Design a protein around this nucleic acid. Structure first.
Ligand code: NA
Ligand code: NA
Ligand code: ZN
Ligand code: ZN
Length: 327
DNA sequence: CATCTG
DNA sequence: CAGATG
């Protein structure tokens, strides 16, 4: 946690490069365990020979750790840090719609910058284009003050669209955070569940309003359940317009919300812990449900949930306000 | 994972 | 349909 940091950090460096730059999924994958293993490893790694001892770690890496130990830097890492071609990728990747795959391409096409983009605005895809258009805003964090404004508006129309809707903004925003990356809203309806066949409108329904009323400006992907879009708080008294922030609406079966709602809220770590103990009280929980573990090694069967309160209760645990849901 | 692209 | 992205 600070005892074999830089080493973990460079391994990570190496890992990401290989993956995104070249296609070293394996090497990449390697970098990763390695960085994962030294991560837990309780001692002061005073050598590669000592590293290697480790599992996942072998011959190549130790070369590296040693150099980093011996001297304060990695030549190959240093040599990587400069290469424009590497840098372009990691940079283009910065776009909403630009994965390393597309990154790699454009670069080999000369497109290496933001301007390049605009120029060759044709070679971008839709998503790809919006990400460009909102390149900056998209990189802008969302301060709670804005979040509640938004949250408010969302909730009022989901209400109008139909009174039976159960929307819920999760995330850290829910975890009580001061700034959130995007608005990730949970959606269900009574009339939507596990077995209940389809009902796309359940989603498209709302997607309109929000648009209808200018809340949503652009769609990034719109389907029956998931909607990946862009929204905007109506710039008040003209002199200040907000940014375009990312939003995501997902329609879920009423029969498996609070499991999801719970789930999505985080933090990962809270999850893990609740998930381990869950395992203790004789259960398992997942992104959709909670069920009874048969001794046979394992077993199914969905437990019914009317609230986060149902779930907690189950594994017999202190209901934790979402504020105190960090770790 | 669900969506879009080609 | 694989393959990409998020
Ligand atoms: Na990207
Ligand atoms: Na393949
Ligand atoms: Zn030690
Ligand atoms: Zn999100």
């Amino acid at each position: 946690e600070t005892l074999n940091g830089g080493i973990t950090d460079m391994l990570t460096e190496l890992a990401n490069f290989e993956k995104n730059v070249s296609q070293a999924i394996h090497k990449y994958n390697a970098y990763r365990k390695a960085a994962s293993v030294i991560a837990k490893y309780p001692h002061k790694i005073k050598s590669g020979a000592e590293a290697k001892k480790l599992p996942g770690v072998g011959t190549k890496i130790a070369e590296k750790i040693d150099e980093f130990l011996a001297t304060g830097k990695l030549r190959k890492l240093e040599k990587i840090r400069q290469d424009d071609t590497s840098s372009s990728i990691n940079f283009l990747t910065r776009v909403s719609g630009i994965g390393p795959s597309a990154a790699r391409k454009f670069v080999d096409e000369g497109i290496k910058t933001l301007e390049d983009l605009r120029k060759n605005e044709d070679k971008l895809n839709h998503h790809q284009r919006i990400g460009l258009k909102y390149f900056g805003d998209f990189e802008k964090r969302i301060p709670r003050e804005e979040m509640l404004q938004m949250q408010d508006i969302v909730l009022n129309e989901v209400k109008k669209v139909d009174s039976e809707y159960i929307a819920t903004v999760c995330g850290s925003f829910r975890r009580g955070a001061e700034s959130s990356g995007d608005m990730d809203v949970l959606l269900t309806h009574p009339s939507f569940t596990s077995e209940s066949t389809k009902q796309p409108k359940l989603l498209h329904q709302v997607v309109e309003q929000l648009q209808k009323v200018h809340f949503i400006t652009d769609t990034l992907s719109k389907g029956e359940t998931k909607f990946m879009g862009v929204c905007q708080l109506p710039s008040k008294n003209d002199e200040k317009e907000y940014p375009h922030r990312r939003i995501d609406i997902r329609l879920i079966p009423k029969d498996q919300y609070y499991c999801g709602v719970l789930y999505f809220t985080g933090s990962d770590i809270f999850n893990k812990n609740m998930r381990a103990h869950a395992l203790e009280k004789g259960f398992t929980i997942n992104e959709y449900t909670i069920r009874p573990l048969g001794v046979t090694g394992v077993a199914g069967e969905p437990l019914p949930v009317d609230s986060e309160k149902d779930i907690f209760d189950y594994i017999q645990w202190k209901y934790r306000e979402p504020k105190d849901r960090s770790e």
